PDB file of C-alpha atoms in Angstrom:
ATOM      1  CA  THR P   1      93.646 230.109 130.833  1.00  0.00           C
ATOM      2  CA  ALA P   2      90.991 227.760 132.216  1.00  0.00           C
ATOM      3  CA  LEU P   3      89.299 229.260 135.267  1.00  0.00           C
ATOM      4  CA  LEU P   4      88.991 227.597 138.660  1.00  0.00           C
ATOM      5  CA  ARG P   5      85.184 227.586 138.334  1.00  0.00           C
ATOM      6  CA  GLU P   6      85.232 225.798 134.947  1.00  0.00           C
ATOM      7  CA  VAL P   7      87.473 222.984 136.217  1.00  0.00           C
ATOM      8  CA  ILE P   8      85.566 222.767 139.500  1.00  0.00           C
ATOM      9  CA  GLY P   9      82.280 222.729 137.588  1.00  0.00           C
ATOM     10  CA  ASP P  10      83.301 219.761 135.441  1.00  0.00           C
ATOM     11  CA  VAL P  11      84.331 217.856 138.571  1.00  0.00           C
ATOM     12  CA  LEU P  12      80.969 218.618 140.187  1.00  0.00           C
ATOM     13  CA  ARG P  13      79.036 217.608 137.063  1.00  0.00           C
ATOM     14  CA  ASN P  14      80.975 214.349 136.783  1.00  0.00           C
ATOM     15  CA  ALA P  15      80.348 213.603 140.469  1.00  0.00           C
ATOM     16  CA  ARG P  16      76.598 214.134 139.953  1.00  0.00           C
ATOM     17  CA  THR P  17      76.144 212.139 136.730  1.00  0.00           C
ATOM     18  CA  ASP P  18      78.337 209.350 138.107  1.00  0.00           C
ATOM     19  CA  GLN P  19      75.373 208.742 140.485  1.00  0.00           C
ATOM     20  CA  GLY P  20      72.685 209.357 137.850  1.00  0.00           C
ATOM     21  CA  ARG P  21      71.317 212.302 139.840  1.00  0.00           C
ATOM     22  CA  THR P  22      69.484 215.168 138.216  1.00  0.00           C
ATOM     23  CA  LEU P  23      70.208 218.857 138.577  1.00  0.00           C
ATOM     24  CA  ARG P  24      66.860 218.980 140.400  1.00  0.00           C
ATOM     25  CA  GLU P  25      67.873 216.381 143.007  1.00  0.00           C
ATOM     26  CA  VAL P  26      71.271 217.886 143.791  1.00  0.00           C
ATOM     27  CA  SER P  27      69.997 221.474 143.779  1.00  0.00           C
ATOM     28  CA  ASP P  28      67.137 220.542 146.145  1.00  0.00           C
ATOM     29  CA  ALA P  29      69.614 218.848 148.475  1.00  0.00           C
ATOM     30  CA  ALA P  30      72.050 221.791 148.289  1.00  0.00           C
ATOM     31  CA  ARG P  31      69.154 224.279 148.629  1.00  0.00           C
ATOM     32  CA  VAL P  32      69.939 226.235 145.452  1.00  0.00           C
ATOM     33  CA  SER P  33      68.044 226.814 142.253  1.00  0.00           C
ATOM     34  CA  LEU P  34      68.436 224.300 139.456  1.00  0.00           C
ATOM     35  CA  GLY P  35      69.609 227.077 137.129  1.00  0.00           C
ATOM     36  CA  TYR P  36      72.255 228.204 139.586  1.00  0.00           C
ATOM     37  CA  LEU P  37      73.624 224.676 139.943  1.00  0.00           C
ATOM     38  CA  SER P  38      73.633 224.223 136.161  1.00  0.00           C
ATOM     39  CA  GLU P  39      75.641 227.440 135.713  1.00  0.00           C
ATOM     40  CA  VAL P  40      78.100 226.374 138.443  1.00  0.00           C
ATOM     41  CA  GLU P  41      78.594 223.046 136.640  1.00  0.00           C
ATOM     42  CA  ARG P  42      79.144 224.847 133.312  1.00  0.00           C
ATOM     43  CA  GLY P  43      81.749 227.107 134.908  1.00  0.00           C
ATOM     44  CA  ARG P  44      79.811 230.346 134.493  1.00  0.00           C
ATOM     45  CA  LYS P  45      78.890 231.034 138.151  1.00  0.00           C
ATOM     46  CA  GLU P  46      81.235 230.995 141.144  1.00  0.00           C
ATOM     47  CA  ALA P  47      80.049 228.717 143.943  1.00  0.00           C
ATOM     48  CA  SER P  48      80.640 230.041 147.456  1.00  0.00           C
ATOM     49  CA  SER P  49      82.586 227.761 149.775  1.00  0.00           C
ATOM     50  CA  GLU P  50      79.338 227.155 151.661  1.00  0.00           C
ATOM     51  CA  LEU P  51      77.502 226.058 148.524  1.00  0.00           C
ATOM     52  CA  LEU P  52      80.420 223.916 147.356  1.00  0.00           C
ATOM     53  CA  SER P  53      80.319 222.114 150.698  1.00  0.00           C
ATOM     54  CA  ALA P  54      76.553 221.649 150.397  1.00  0.00           C
ATOM     55  CA  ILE P  55      76.991 220.131 146.909  1.00  0.00           C
ATOM     56  CA  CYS P  56      79.782 217.829 148.106  1.00  0.00           C
ATOM     57  CA  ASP P  57      77.533 216.723 150.976  1.00  0.00           C
ATOM     58  CA  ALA P  58      74.610 216.078 148.604  1.00  0.00           C
ATOM     59  CA  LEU P  59      76.940 213.928 146.507  1.00  0.00           C
ATOM     60  CA  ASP P  60      78.876 212.279 149.377  1.00  0.00           C
ATOM     61  CA  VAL P  61      82.145 213.430 147.789  1.00  0.00           C
ATOM     62  CA  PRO P  62      84.901 214.876 150.007  1.00  0.00           C
ATOM     63  CA  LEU P  63      85.911 218.421 149.146  1.00  0.00           C
ATOM     64  CA  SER P  64      89.516 217.217 149.328  1.00  0.00           C
ATOM     65  CA  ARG P  65      88.887 214.913 146.357  1.00  0.00           C
ATOM     66  CA  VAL P  66      87.106 217.667 144.425  1.00  0.00           C
ATOM     67  CA  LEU P  67      90.147 219.927 144.897  1.00  0.00           C
ATOM     68  CA  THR P  68      92.696 217.223 144.034  1.00  0.00           C
ATOM     69  CA  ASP P  69      90.774 216.146 140.953  1.00  0.00           C
ATOM     70  CA  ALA P  70      90.408 219.769 139.869  1.00  0.00           C
ATOM     71  CA  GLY P  71      94.141 220.283 140.358  1.00  0.00           C
ATOM     72  CA  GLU P  72      94.976 217.212 138.257  1.00  0.00           C
ATOM     73  CA  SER P  73      92.636 218.457 135.539  1.00  0.00           C
ATOM     74  CA  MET P  74      94.085 221.959 135.714  1.00  0.00           C
ATOM     75  CA  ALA P  75      97.599 220.487 135.485  1.00  0.00           C
ATOM     76  CA  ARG P  76      96.534 218.717 132.297  1.00  0.00           C
ATOM     77  CA  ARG P  77      95.189 221.982 130.887  1.00  0.00           C
ATOM     78  CA  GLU P  78      98.412 223.817 131.784  1.00  0.00           C
ATOM     79  CA  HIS P  79     100.419 221.017 130.146  1.00  0.00           C
ATOM     80  CA  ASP P  80      98.453 221.383 126.891  1.00  0.00           C
TER      81      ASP P  80
ATOM     82  CA  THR T   1      84.071 221.757 158.382  1.00  0.00           C
ATOM     83  CA  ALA T   2      86.942 223.831 156.990  1.00  0.00           C
ATOM     84  CA  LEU T   3      85.797 225.942 154.049  1.00  0.00           C
ATOM     85  CA  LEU T   4      87.386 225.975 150.606  1.00  0.00           C
ATOM     86  CA  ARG T   5      88.310 229.657 151.043  1.00  0.00           C
ATOM     87  CA  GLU T   6      90.134 229.061 154.358  1.00  0.00           C
ATOM     88  CA  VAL T   7      92.297 226.268 152.918  1.00  0.00           C
ATOM     89  CA  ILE T   8      92.864 228.190 149.687  1.00  0.00           C
ATOM     90  CA  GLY T   9      93.737 231.301 151.692  1.00  0.00           C
ATOM     91  CA  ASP T  10      96.440 229.528 153.695  1.00  0.00           C
ATOM     92  CA  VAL T  11      97.953 228.195 150.468  1.00  0.00           C
ATOM     93  CA  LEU T  12      97.964 231.700 148.981  1.00  0.00           C
ATOM     94  CA  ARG T  13      99.495 233.222 152.120  1.00  0.00           C
ATOM     95  CA  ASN T  14     102.208 230.558 152.221  1.00  0.00           C
ATOM     96  CA  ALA T  15     102.972 231.129 148.530  1.00  0.00           C
ATOM     97  CA  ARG T  16     103.362 234.876 149.175  1.00  0.00           C
ATOM     98  CA  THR T  17     105.501 234.725 152.333  1.00  0.00           C
ATOM     99  CA  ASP T  18     107.648 231.988 150.790  1.00  0.00           C
ATOM    100  CA  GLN T  19     108.873 234.811 148.478  1.00  0.00           C
ATOM    101  CA  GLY T  20     108.991 237.467 151.212  1.00  0.00           C
ATOM    102  CA  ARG T  21     106.398 239.567 149.374  1.00  0.00           C
ATOM    103  CA  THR T  22     104.099 241.963 151.157  1.00  0.00           C
ATOM    104  CA  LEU T  23     100.333 242.144 150.914  1.00  0.00           C
ATOM    105  CA  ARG T  24     100.956 245.492 149.196  1.00  0.00           C
ATOM    106  CA  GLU T  25     103.163 243.992 146.465  1.00  0.00           C
ATOM    107  CA  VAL T  26     100.871 241.078 145.638  1.00  0.00           C
ATOM    108  CA  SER T  27      97.690 243.162 145.822  1.00  0.00           C
ATOM    109  CA  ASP T  28      99.205 245.807 143.508  1.00  0.00           C
ATOM    110  CA  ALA T  29     100.193 243.089 141.044  1.00  0.00           C
ATOM    111  CA  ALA T  30      96.763 241.412 141.268  1.00  0.00           C
ATOM    112  CA  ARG T  31      95.024 244.825 141.106  1.00  0.00           C
ATOM    113  CA  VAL T  32      93.033 244.406 144.330  1.00  0.00           C
ATOM    114  CA  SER T  33      93.014 246.263 147.602  1.00  0.00           C
ATOM    115  CA  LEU T  34      95.444 245.184 150.291  1.00  0.00           C
ATOM    116  CA  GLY T  35      92.537 244.614 152.685  1.00  0.00           C
ATOM    117  CA  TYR T  36      90.742 242.403 150.195  1.00  0.00           C
ATOM    118  CA  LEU T  37      93.833 240.254 149.667  1.00  0.00           C
ATOM    119  CA  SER T  38      94.381 239.997 153.427  1.00  0.00           C
ATOM    120  CA  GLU T  39      90.794 238.790 153.936  1.00  0.00           C
ATOM    121  CA  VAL T  40      91.165 236.252 151.097  1.00  0.00           C
ATOM    122  CA  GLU T  41      94.333 234.920 152.759  1.00  0.00           C
ATOM    123  CA  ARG T  42      92.551 234.686 156.134  1.00  0.00           C
ATOM    124  CA  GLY T  43      89.691 232.750 154.548  1.00  0.00           C
ATOM    125  CA  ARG T  44      87.019 235.383 155.141  1.00  0.00           C
ATOM    126  CA  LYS T  45      86.462 236.575 151.540  1.00  0.00           C
ATOM    127  CA  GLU T  46      85.854 234.401 148.480  1.00  0.00           C
ATOM    128  CA  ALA T  47      88.266 235.120 145.633  1.00  0.00           C
ATOM    129  CA  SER T  48      86.738 234.990 142.157  1.00  0.00           C
ATOM    130  CA  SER T  49      88.421 232.648 139.697  1.00  0.00           C
ATOM    131  CA  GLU T  50      89.725 235.729 137.887  1.00  0.00           C
ATOM    132  CA  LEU T  51      91.319 237.136 141.033  1.00  0.00           C
ATOM    133  CA  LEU T  52      92.739 233.752 142.034  1.00  0.00           C
ATOM    134  CA  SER T  53      94.416 233.550 138.632  1.00  0.00           C
ATOM    135  CA  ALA T  54      95.770 237.085 139.025  1.00  0.00           C
ATOM    136  CA  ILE T  55      97.242 236.171 142.440  1.00  0.00           C
ATOM    137  CA  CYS T  56      98.779 232.961 141.076  1.00  0.00           C
ATOM    138  CA  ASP T  57     100.303 234.992 138.234  1.00  0.00           C
ATOM    139  CA  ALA T  58     101.693 237.588 140.665  1.00  0.00           C
ATOM    140  CA  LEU T  59     103.289 234.740 142.611  1.00  0.00           C
ATOM    141  CA  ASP T  60     104.346 232.577 139.626  1.00  0.00           C
ATOM    142  CA  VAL T  61     102.499 229.616 141.159  1.00  0.00           C
ATOM    143  CA  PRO T  62     100.376 227.365 138.917  1.00  0.00           C
ATOM    144  CA  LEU T  63      96.718 227.189 139.879  1.00  0.00           C
ATOM    145  CA  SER T  64      97.026 223.412 139.547  1.00  0.00           C
ATOM    146  CA  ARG T  65      99.500 223.367 142.446  1.00  0.00           C
ATOM    147  CA  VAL T  66      97.306 225.675 144.532  1.00  0.00           C
ATOM    148  CA  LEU T  67      94.376 223.273 144.055  1.00  0.00           C
ATOM    149  CA  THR T  68      96.421 220.128 144.742  1.00  0.00           C
ATOM    150  CA  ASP T  69      98.014 221.623 147.835  1.00  0.00           C
ATOM    151  CA  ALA T  70      94.614 222.795 149.065  1.00  0.00           C
ATOM    152  CA  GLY T  71      93.215 219.310 148.486  1.00  0.00           C
ATOM    153  CA  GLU T  72      96.060 217.695 150.445  1.00  0.00           C
ATOM    154  CA  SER T  73      95.487 220.160 153.275  1.00  0.00           C
ATOM    155  CA  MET T  74      91.737 219.587 153.188  1.00  0.00           C
ATOM    156  CA  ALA T  75      92.339 215.818 153.259  1.00  0.00           C
ATOM    157  CA  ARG T  76      94.404 216.316 156.409  1.00  0.00           C
ATOM    158  CA  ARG T  77      91.594 218.340 157.979  1.00  0.00           C
ATOM    159  CA  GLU T  78      89.022 215.677 157.057  1.00  0.00           C
ATOM    160  CA  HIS T  79      91.311 213.006 158.529  1.00  0.00           C
ATOM    161  CA  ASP T  80      91.518 214.879 161.852  1.00  0.00           C
TER     162      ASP T  80
END
């Protein structure tokens, strides 16, 4: 039901707000438009692997942890 | 270093060959070209969330397990 990009987006949004960073700051660092980042966080735009890595780098979060956290969230959704 | 789509692709390829299925059988079930599926498995094409879900369904593998396994693999790559 829930799509990869929605569960990934929530993980990315939580990683950003857990450092009090704005869409502007992360999008500047990742070299993407603010509106594109917002839509990725809301699960309405697919982020390329290259952009995902750029966002993880801007947030100092390992992509491994993004994937594991997304999998745990997706397992919760499947279980509900 | 390693891109999300390369680690995801290996997980998808392993899920397919662990059931002895061909690219043709999974691509027919997922309604994508054989060449597109092959390139997704090799990590050279990004799979949309919709196509990823269609591949997981064709393989009876939960997307949660694909994400967790990809995260464990990516953690190995980061650790090396």
